[PDB]
């Protein structure tokens, strides 16, 4: 990429979420969403492999129709209130549209089909951006409008996502898609507490970002899109085997690690609000997510899969190092739990 183009695109992919967050005029929030859609598509097809064009063409159509639905909600509001922004008075259907639409861009629940497929055809790098710096934008729009959205729908999309994410993940063996599925799940918890305590959504996101960003830079350190590929981690780079183990169990909710806090406080907030029906079912299938996380643990760490002689060759050569971010985001993530009170 002519480095100039790289700058323009990257600026847009970054001006995209930032305009959304900063503005209050919904319109300006919509174009922030629009710029993110335009900026991400070029990077998605960088290899320009036949799989890639498929990825972008799906991502784009799914993103575009949702963008149009979000605009329709703003256009309708404009006629039910002269304001260009959702208010207490807003017709309920107007808000529900925004939930569905925004739940498509974020890819939650019954609209979770595009994400796993686009996460499969894009590079590991652009995978991260597509999973974590593109969720900030839509979520911002929701978090702003939380007082007004429906508790019922969110919960249904929340629970569905948790289930779909978990069930989908169990079968998958491609890593990119295992992560895509996890993101659907975590995204679910996040949207469950939005109606009740938005501030916790912003924790269940950061922690997801501080967990997923190290996890993916791990997958690419050896650029392994297969579990079999990550399983030979012990030969290619032995040290990351320890933290890859804890980060994945952290992604699932197991108690000593940082990953428990988001689930724990979301459950505490939902029980405070009396959803002890919903919270219970979510926590239970949340346990299904750890099963596929630990199955990967087995292959990568607890058991040593057989490797190839040609690997001895890759050991010889100095391994290009993992950026510092890996460490700082691996530790702050695997073990901050002793510092939970200040996080929330």
């Amino acid at each position: 990429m002519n480095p100039i183009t790289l700058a323009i695109i990257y600026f847009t992919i970054f001006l995209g979420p930032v305009i959304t967050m900063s503005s209050t005029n919904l319109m300006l929030m919509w174009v922030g969403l629009e710029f993110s859609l335009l900026a991400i598509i070029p990077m998605l097809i960088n290899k320009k492999n036949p799989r890639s064009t498929e990825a972008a063409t799906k991502y784009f159509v799914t993103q575009a129709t949702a963008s149009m639905i979000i605009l329709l909600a703003i256009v309708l509001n404009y006629k039910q209130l002269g304001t260009w922004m959702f208010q207490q008075q807003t017709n309920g259907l107007i808000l529900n549209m925004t939930l569905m639409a925004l739940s498509m861009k974020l890819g939650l629940a019954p609209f979770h089909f595009w994400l796993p497929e686009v996460t499969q055809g894009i590079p590991l790098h652009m995978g991260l951006i597509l999973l974590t710096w593109q969720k900030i934008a839509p979520l911002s729009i929701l978090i702003q409008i939380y007082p007004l959205l429906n508790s019922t729908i969110i919960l249904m999309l929340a629970i569905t996502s948790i289930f779909m994410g978990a069930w989908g993940g169990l079968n998958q063996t491609q890593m990119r898609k295992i992560m895509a599925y996890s993101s659907i799940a975590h995204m679910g918890w996040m949207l469950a507490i939005l109606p009740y305590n938005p501030s916790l959504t912003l924790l269940n996101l950061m922690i997801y970002i501080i967990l997923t960003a190290p996890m993916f830079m791990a997958l690419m350190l050896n650029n392994s899109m297969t579990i079999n590929s990550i399983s030979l981690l012990w030969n290619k780079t032995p040290a990351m085997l320890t933290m890859i183990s804890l980060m994945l169990l952290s992604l699932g909710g197991l108690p000593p690690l940082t990953g428990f806090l988001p689930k724990w406080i979301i459950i505490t907030e939902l029980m405070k609000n009396n959803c002890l029906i919903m919270a219970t079912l979510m926590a239970m299938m949340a346990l299904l997510n750890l099963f596929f996380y630990t199955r990967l643990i087995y292959s990568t760490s607890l058991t040593m899969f057989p490797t190839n002689n040609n690997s001895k060759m890759m050991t010889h050569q100095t391994k290009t190092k993992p950026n510092l971010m890996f460490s700082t985001l691996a530790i702050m993530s695997t073990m901050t739990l002793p510092l939970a009170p200040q996080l929330i």
């Binding site: 197991l254 108690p255 000593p256 459950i267 750890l290 087995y298």
Partner: protein, 459 residues
């Protein structure tokens, strides 16, 4: 209680920083002394509980265990110096640290005031244990065993998480001290009848009940000796400690919500005891012995009579020490024999004279010989169970007859009869093997002299 804990944490720095050749002695020697500092908690001169500080407390029920948890780390590190002596010098220092973290976590869990501190630390102990079982497990099936050990505990665990957050909202703090001195009386609704099950079920799972105990036979089979010692001696008892502190609340329901478990346990005690009678794997038989002798405990922590409780406290500490002793000697046969089969290796006393004396004393502890805390324990649970319903003696009476039979069969077909013709010649006994045993039984003899210390909260 941060001397039983901080000095413990520092063990981790010592296992790592120390020389590869000297790593074993620094760690084992120091935790022996760590156990000596643990003995200070036993100095209770009045009935009031020693609340060290806001988060850390030790009452009669926890103190007898914290000392056992600190005591076994030395022993665990002495029983795994053989296997795990074939490793790369960084696999060892990981195993040693894993064992160290278990008692750091277990010491805190047994010494925790806030019930959810129990939960976080309670369910954390699975991480160190699953690594010990899966990473170093000899058999092809440990991946499976690990899954069983993680899911049975985890599916039970999330209900307890919801329940404890639930009581915090209902009462306003999960502090065991207050919860005790506050009025939390459930109201026998249909919902409460569920709360009670939510709180007890997670504890009932890791304390193998007849219905959910399949995890323990599978886990101890392929687990390395140190993991099997930890699971039998401290890990299973985590479930019992939880049931004692959690039933302070949910006071009214267990009067009538316990029948299901009580009957599950007493019939379970008979069947688990009996299948020990014909099981070819020795580690298998000890594990089911552990299920049955722990089925007695869930049937005393539910009858809830003063004697039951301390019968329970007596038996849990006693059976913990005895089971390990049995799992430790089973390993010594396994390493020379190279097979878990009970039928092979017949006649060992002819070739290992002393280990057989340790085998005999371990079996007599296993069955209820009378000048032993093991018998005092069962005698007491038996008494209360009789009080609950005189008929209970029949079922707790078929178990005693069966328990005698399998305990002696382990001695009769492993340590007597004609010697096996020529298995790989059985090298003589190391002094470590014998001490690891002596270290288990010498405390069993000393505790039996003054049973008062392990009697529980009730008495």
């Amino acid at each position: 209680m941060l001397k039983i804990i901080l000095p413990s944490l520092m063990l981790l720095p010592l296992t790592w920083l120390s020389s590869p050749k000297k790593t074993w002695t620094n760690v084992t020697s120091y935790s022996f002394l760590i156990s000596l500092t643990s003995l200070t908690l036993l100095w209770q001169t009045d009935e009031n509980y020693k609340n060290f500080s806001n988060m850390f407390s030790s009452d009669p029920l926890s103190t007898p265990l914290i000392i056992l948890t600190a005591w076994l780390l030395p022993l665990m590190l002495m029983a795994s110096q053989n296997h795990l002596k074939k490793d790369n010098n960084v696999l060892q220092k990981l195993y040693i640290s894993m064992l160290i973290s278990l008692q750091i976590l277990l010491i805190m869990t047994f010494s925790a005031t806030e019930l959810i501190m129990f939960y976080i630390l309670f369910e954390a102990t699975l991480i160190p244990t699953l690594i010990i079982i899966t990473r170093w497990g000899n058999q092809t099936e440990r991946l499976n065993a690990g899954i069983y050990f993680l899911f049975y505990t985890l599916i039970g665990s999330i209900p307890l998480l919801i329940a404890l957050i639930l009581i915090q909202n209902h009462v306003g703090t999960l502090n065991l001290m207050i919860l005790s001195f506050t009025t939390h009386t459930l109201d026998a609704s249909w919902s409460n009848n569920l709360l009670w099950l939510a709180c007890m079920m997670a504890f009932l799972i890791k304390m193998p009940l007849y219905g959910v105990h399949l995890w323990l036979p599978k886990a101890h089979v392929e687990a390395p000796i140190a993991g099997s010692m930890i699971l039998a001696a401290i890990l299973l008892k985590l479930g019992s400690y939880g049931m004692i502190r959690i039933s302070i609340i949910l006071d009214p329901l267990t009067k009538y919500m316990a029948y299901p478990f009580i009957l599950l346990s007493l019939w379970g005690m008979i069947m688990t005891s009996s299948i020990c009678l014909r099981q070819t794997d020795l580690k298998s038989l000890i594990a089911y012995s552990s299920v049955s002798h722990m089925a007695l405990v869930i049937a005393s922590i539910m009858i809830q009579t003063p004697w039951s409780f301390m019968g329970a406290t007596m038996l849990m500490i006693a059976h913990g020490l005895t089971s390990s002793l049995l799992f430790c000697l089973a390993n010594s046969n396994y390493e020379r024999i190279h097979s878990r089969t009970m039928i092979m290796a017949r006649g060992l006393q002819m070739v290992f004279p002393l280990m057989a004396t340790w085998w005999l004393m371990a079996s007599l502890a296993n069955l209820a010989l009378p000048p032993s805390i093991n018998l005092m324990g069962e005698l007491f649970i038996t008494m209360s169970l009789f009080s609950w319903s005189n008929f209970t003696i029949i079922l707790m009476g078929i178990n005693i007859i069966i328990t005698g039979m399998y305990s002696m069969y382990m001695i009769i077909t492993t340590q007597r009869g004609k010697l096996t013709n020529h298995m790989i010649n059985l090298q003589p006994s190391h002094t470590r093997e014998l001490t690891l045993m002596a270290l288990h039984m010498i405390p069993l003899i000393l505790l039996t002299t003054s049973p008062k210390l392990i009697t529980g909260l009730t008495m």
